[PDB]
Amino acid sequence: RFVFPEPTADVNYIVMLTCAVCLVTYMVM
Amino acid sequence: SVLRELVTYLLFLIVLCILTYGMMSSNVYYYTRMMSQLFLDTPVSKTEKTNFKTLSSMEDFWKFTEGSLLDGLYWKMQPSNQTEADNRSFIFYENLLLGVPRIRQLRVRNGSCSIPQDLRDEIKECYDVYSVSSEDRAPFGPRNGTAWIYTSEKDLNGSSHWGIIATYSGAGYYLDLSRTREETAAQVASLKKNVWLDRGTRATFIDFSVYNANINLFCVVRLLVEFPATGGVIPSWQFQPLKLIRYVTTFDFFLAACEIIFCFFIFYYVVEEILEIRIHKLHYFRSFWNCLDVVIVVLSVVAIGINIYRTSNVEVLLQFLEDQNTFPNFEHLAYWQIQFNNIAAVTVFFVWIKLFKFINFNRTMSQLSTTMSRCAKDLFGFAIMFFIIFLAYAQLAYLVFGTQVDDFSTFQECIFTQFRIILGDINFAEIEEANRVLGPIYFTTFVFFMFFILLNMFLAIINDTYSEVKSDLAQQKAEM
Ligand SMILES: *[C@@H]1O[C@H](CO)[C@@H](O)[C@H](O)[C@H]1NC(C)=O
Ligand SMILES: *[C@@H]1O[C@H](CO)[C@@H](O)[C@H](O)[C@H]1NC(C)=O
Numbered sequence: 001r002f003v004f005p006e007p008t009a010d011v012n013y014i015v016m017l018t019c020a021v022c023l024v025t026y027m028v029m
Numbered sequence: 030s031v032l033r034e035l036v037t038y039l040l041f042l043i044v045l046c047i048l049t050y051g052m053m054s055s056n057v058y059y060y061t062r063m064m065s066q067l068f069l070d071t072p073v074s075k076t077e078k079t080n081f082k083t084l085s086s087m088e089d090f091w092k093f094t095e096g097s098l099l100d101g102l103y104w105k106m107q108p109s110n111q112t113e114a115d116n117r118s119f120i121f122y123e124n125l126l127l128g129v130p131r132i133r134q135l136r137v138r139n140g141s142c143s144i145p146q147d148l149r150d151e152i153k154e155c156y157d158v159y160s161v162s163s164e165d166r167a168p169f170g171p172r173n174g175t176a177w178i179y180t181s182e183k184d185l186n187g188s189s190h191w192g193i194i195a196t197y198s199g200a201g202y203y204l205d206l207s208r209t210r211e212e213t214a215a216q217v218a219s220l221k222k223n224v225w226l227d228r229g230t231r232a233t234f235i236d237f238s239v240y241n242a243n244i245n246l247f248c249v250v251r252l253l254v255e256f257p258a259t260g261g262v263i264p265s266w267q268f269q270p271l272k273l274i275r276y277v278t279t280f281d282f283f284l285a286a287c288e289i290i291f292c293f294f295i296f297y298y299v300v301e302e303i304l305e306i307r308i309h310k311l312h313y314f315r316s317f318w319n320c321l322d323v324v325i326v327v328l329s330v331v332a333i334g335i336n337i338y339r340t341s342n343v344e345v346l347l348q349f350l351e352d353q354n355t356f357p358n359f360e361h362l363a364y365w366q367i368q369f370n371n372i373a374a375v376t377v378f379f380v381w382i383k384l385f386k387f388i389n390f391n392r393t394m395s396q397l398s399t400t401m402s403r404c405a406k407d408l409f410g411f412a413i414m415f416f417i418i419f420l421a422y423a424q425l426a427y428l429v430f431g432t433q434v435d436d437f438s439t440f441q442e443c444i445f446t447q448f449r450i451i452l453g454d455i456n457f458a459e460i461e462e463a464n465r466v467l468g469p470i471y472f473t474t475f476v477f478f479m480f481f482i483l484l485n486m487f488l489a490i491i492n493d494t495y496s497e498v499k500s501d502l503a504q505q506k507a508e509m
């Protein structure tokens with residue numbers, strides 16, 4: 001049922017910030 | 030053996046300097062300057078005071094097009110001959126106009142956005158920001174020729190541009206003008222009569238090129254006008270003086286020989302580097318003089334590859350020389366020339382840094398290198414904190430003053446402004462008229478903290494280690 005959707009060009013900052021924080025906390029831990 | 034490598038590095042320096050001497054030719058800045066003054070500085074009208082650099086509305090664009098643009102493109106015919114039919118135009122009696130200029134636009138679709146249901150009565154039309162997924166691909170208006178019909182990117186042989194607001198595609202609604210002013214003006218008037226630039230247009234490109242047979246140097250001119258979704262007009266331009274007929278004179282043969290010698294030098298350097306790494310010192314990376322070597326080799330290989338790619342792919346000029354009444358597509362060549370120039374510049378910059386390996390001849394120069402090597406670690410350690418505080422200030426400025434000052438409109442712009450403040454290159458005006466509170470507070474705190482604390486801390490870090498190294502060397506010399 002996979003679609004390979006969204007050929008659109010946009011950026012969602014919420015997901016990027018969450019992932020960056022979750023990686024930085026591991027790096028400092 | 031401190032002498033086999035020194036000589037072959039001075040030879041490399043000589044070859045590189047010879048290469049960039051002919052690459053950056055003289056009497057080239059004046060050519061671009063004259064073109065820029067002719068096109069971007071002539072007022073759009075005799076009674077008007079605006080030029081291309083200060084376009085303010087879609088009505089000003091139409092005044093510029095059928096106006097200061099046609100005046101600079103189709104110069105006089107200098108009538109002294111038969112003038113059989115539609116004689117060509119020399120822009121400065123020296124600059125030949127190649128082919129014919131092209132104009133094109135990129136627009137969006139009426140049913141793009143989604144206005145809220147609360148006020149869906151007083152709002153009838155809406156157009157979203159430019160995007161590939163929200164592009165118009167249907168005939169509009171008098172669907173008669175190629176100016177009212179979409180034509181895909183592959184059919185124009187175009188590519189992206191990466192303008193100021195977004196990255197525009199290579200497709201759109203285009204039109205090729207005529208070779209004489211009396212016909213190009215008629216075509217533009219016909220385009221303007223029945224509206225061609227509606228409210229849904231997002232960008233407009235105008236492209237042409239010139240030759241200047243005196244000094245063999247082509248020049249491609251591109252002018253872009255961006256219409257953002259929020260209104261207004263943003264102009265941009267580029268004038269690239271590229272060359273395509275290199276081997277005409279003996280100096281070009283000399284430059285080709287120098288390029289061949291440079292390729293041989295790069296091959297020798299990469300062979301010796303791989304020979305060293307294959308057997309000796311399988312770690313090899315704790316010296317800071319080997320990362321520079323691999324960086325130089327990689328950059329030089331990339332430059333050679335780009336040069337070969339953009340020198341073999343010159344079939345566009347051959348195609349143009351068959352039929353000279355067609356638009357010459359010379360944009361990829363200019364893009365690759367810009368890329369090659371950047372790569373060559375950074376490589377030339379890094380070679381002079383590599384030069385540092387050999388200035389250690391006398392004792393008074395050994396202590397300076399020793400001090401730098403000993404203090405680099407602490408300098409990096411403090412630079413981490415310096416950059417963290419700098420970025421905190423930059424993000425605060427971006428979030429506070431980033432919508433009104435036009436100097437903090439972007440994070441990069443905030444960083445550049447904060448570096449310029451250190452230079453004492455700030456006006457202190459737009460900050461305070463932007464906000465009478467938290468305006469001067471930010472400036473005062475930034476100047477105080479940054480300048481005093483961090484500059485003096487850097488000075489202390491360098492001075493302490495310099496004094497320690499000098500005292501250690503003096504004691505060792507006096508005790509031996
Ligand atoms: C654009 O679409 C709206 C409804 O989505 C419609 O009312 C309007 O007439 C359309 N305009 C054009 C020029 O098609
Ligand atoms: C539309 O095409 C017809 C073809 O016969 C031509 O006569 C007419 O001038 C054109 N109108 C334009 C280009 O506005």
Ligand SMILES: *[C@@H]1O[C@H](CO)[C@@H](O)[C@H](O)[C@H]1NC(C)=O
Nearest residue numbers: 183184185186348355356358
């Ligand atoms: C694009 O490339 C094709 C392929 O050679 C060529 O025939 C054509 O003239 C070029 N330009 C346009 C506008 O199609």
